[PDB]
Design an enzyme around this catalytic site. Structure first.
Site, PDB file in Angstrom:
ATOM      1  N   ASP A  77      -6.737  56.567  32.942  1.00  0.00           N
ATOM      2  CA  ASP A  77      -6.590  55.229  32.326  1.00  0.00           C
ATOM      3  C   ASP A  77      -5.610  55.203  31.147  1.00  0.00           C
ATOM      4  O   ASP A  77      -5.975  55.501  30.012  1.00  0.00           O
ATOM      5  CB  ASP A  77      -7.946  54.694  31.869  1.00  0.00           C
TER       6      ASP A  77
ATOM      7  N   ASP B 224      -1.927  49.190  31.944  1.00  0.00           N
ATOM      8  CA  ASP B 224      -3.336  49.602  32.086  1.00  0.00           C
ATOM      9  C   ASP B 224      -3.700  50.046  33.514  1.00  0.00           C
ATOM     10  O   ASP B 224      -3.924  49.221  34.406  1.00  0.00           O
ATOM     11  CB  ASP B 224      -4.250  48.465  31.674  1.00  0.00           C
TER      12      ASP B 224
HETATM   13  C1  LIG Z   1     -12.737  49.189  32.498  1.00  0.00           C
HETATM   14  O1  LIG Z   1     -11.495  48.577  32.161  1.00  0.00           O
HETATM   15  C2  LIG Z   1     -10.696  49.512  31.593  1.00  0.00           C
HETATM   16  O2  LIG Z   1     -10.991  50.693  31.540  1.00  0.00           O
HETATM   17  C3  LIG Z   1      -9.387  48.957  31.096  1.00  0.00           C
HETATM   18  C4  LIG Z   1      -9.520  47.739  30.205  1.00  0.00           C
HETATM   19  C5  LIG Z   1      -9.557  48.276  28.790  1.00  0.00           C
HETATM   20  C6  LIG Z   1      -8.983  49.680  28.815  1.00  0.00           C
HETATM   21  N1  LIG Z   1      -8.720  49.991  30.255  1.00  0.00           N
HETATM   22  C7  LIG Z   1     -10.985  48.220  28.292  1.00  0.00           C
HETATM   23  O3  LIG Z   1     -11.945  48.738  28.853  1.00  0.00           O
HETATM   24  N2  LIG Z   1     -11.031  47.355  27.210  1.00  0.00           N
HETATM   25  C8  LIG Z   1      -9.737  46.918  26.894  1.00  0.00           C
HETATM   26  C9  LIG Z   1      -9.352  46.112  25.853  1.00  0.00           C
HETATM   27  C10 LIG Z   1      -8.012  45.856  25.704  1.00  0.00           C
HETATM   28  C11 LIG Z   1      -7.096  46.374  26.597  1.00  0.00           C
HETATM   29  C12 LIG Z   1      -7.506  47.185  27.637  1.00  0.00           C
HETATM   30  C13 LIG Z   1      -8.849  47.432  27.786  1.00  0.00           C
END
Ligand SMILES: COC(=O)[C@H]1C[C@]2(CN1)C(=O)Nc1ccccc12
Ligand SMILES: [Zn+2]
EC number: 3.4.23.46
Length: 394
Positions: A224, A34
């Site tokens: 992302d 991530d």
């Molecule tokens: C602002 O944090 C981000 O953009 C990260 C974290 C993220 C995706 N990328 C999100 O938002 N929900 C989520 C739920 C599961 C895994 C990753 C994420």
């Protein structure tokens, strides 16, 4: 960097993960890669979606930081206990690092049923780490403790009872030239928090959307790997869908399709790709008044999903969606390209991926330079809250 090739896996739309070990002796866990966050956090207790989880008590090298951590996203949320332990990436560099680890003790709508990952590797910067920016991120500790160069690169690739398997490569400490063709173009990292960039122009099949370019980056633009879709600010999303609908108008899809809530299908092998336009995002170049474009195909923004019903059909989901928190260049964008996170030089490189999905008439492309005279400022300045203003930074 041959030992790191093909070190990523996952299921389509549910995340790319890398195998890591934590503790002594090493516990193996699958960890989501991530670039949109900055914490290393791992399932640390039972959950109906986890096969396995980090057990701190079985590790001789674990140290408890006697502090808790809480991370809500919009969609998604977890909390846990902070500590440190030894961490390695088996199909990564041949080193072991002492890193911060958040042991997730409770969560809601975080873990994804069937995704086969048990934690998250936040690869972004300390500024957006929780509980605050004194919790050193994994990559920072890797660079400080070892000789690994301050750069990593991602090649994300290929997308009836289960979702399709995907593959990719995370090259830690360098660039593998087998993973791309043609030239590597660099866009500045605007600020080191998210991997923030600046989009200066958008075209749909050659046609400029002709918006004030600040709208493209309202309220930021970020790269992302942990987001599936290309997400666009409301106004931009509307203009984009209007233009894509116009290109594709021989086909009258339901509203649900354009909302990402419904598949559309054609007989196997007959999908009319050529009625769907290419989308070009111009990114600010390293040089004043220069830009370069990255161009993606419908093969990127139409995601293939196998209908247990009509498994005789090729069916797709629309993977461009509306945002209220800025542009997100997610896996839809990244699956076009080999993407270099050149932290040492405060820049992000894009080249055409040696594995991107295309056809016999069009390809994903990275092309430049393009030049503008008296190029305005396309960056947005997020209103400053008193809460954020009051923070000290020692
Ligand atoms: C602002 O944090 C981000 O953009 C990260 C974290 C993220 C995706 N990328 C999100 O938002 N929900 C989520 C739920 C599961 C895994 C990753 C994420
Ligand atoms: Zn102070």
């Amino acid at each position: 960097f041959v030992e790191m090739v093909d070190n990523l896996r996952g299921k389509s739309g549910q995340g790319y993960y890398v195998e890591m070990t934590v503790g002594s002796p090493p516990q193996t866990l699958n960890i989501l890669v991530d670039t949109g966050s900055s914490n290393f956090a791992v399932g640390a207790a039972p959950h109906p979606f986890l096969h396995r989880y980090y057990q701190r008590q079985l590790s001789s090298t674990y140290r408890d930081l006697r502090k808790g951590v809480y991370v809500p996203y919009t969609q998604g949320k977890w909390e846990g206990e902070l500590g440190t332990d030894l961490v390695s990436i088996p199909h990564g560099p041949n080193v072991t690092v002492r890193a911060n680890i958040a042991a997730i003790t409770e969560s809601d709508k975080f873990f994804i049923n069937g995704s086969n990952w048990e934690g998250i590797l936040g690869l972004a910067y300390a500024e957006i780490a929780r509980p605050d920016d004194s919790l050193e991120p994994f990559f920072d500790s890797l660079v400080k403790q070892t000789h690994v160069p301050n750069l990593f690169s991602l090649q994300l690739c290929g997308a009836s009872e289960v979702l399709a398997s995907v593959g990719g490569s995370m090259i830690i400490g360098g660039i593998d030239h087998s993973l791309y063709t043609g030239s590597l173009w660099y866009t500045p990292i605007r600020r080191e928090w998210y991997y923030e960039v600046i989009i200066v122009r958008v075209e749909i099949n050659g046609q400029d959307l002709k918006m004030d370019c600040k709208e493209y980056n309202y309220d930021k633009s970020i790269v992302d790997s942990g987001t599936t879709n290309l997400r666009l600010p409301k106004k931009v999303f509307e203009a984009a869908v209007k233009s894509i609908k116009a290109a594709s108008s021989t086909e009258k899809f339901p509203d649900g399709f354009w909302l990402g809530e419904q598949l559309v299908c054609w007989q196997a092998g007959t999908t009319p790709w050529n009625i769907f336009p290419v989308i070009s995002l111009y990114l600010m170049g390293e040089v004043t008044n220069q830009s370069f474009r990255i161009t993606i195909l419908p093969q990127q923004y139409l995601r293939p999903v196998e209908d247990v019903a009509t498994s005789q059909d090729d069916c797709y989901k629309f993977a461009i969606s509306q945002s209220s928190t800025g542009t997100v260049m997610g896996a839809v964008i990244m699956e076009g390209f080999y993407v270099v996170f050149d932290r040492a030089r405060k820049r992000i490189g894009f080249a055409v991926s040696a594995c991107h999905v295309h056809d016999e008439f069009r390809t994903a492309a990275v092309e430049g330079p393009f030049v503008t005279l008296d190029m305005e400022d396309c960056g947005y300045n997020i209103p400053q809250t008193d809460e954020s203003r009051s923070h000290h930074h020692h």
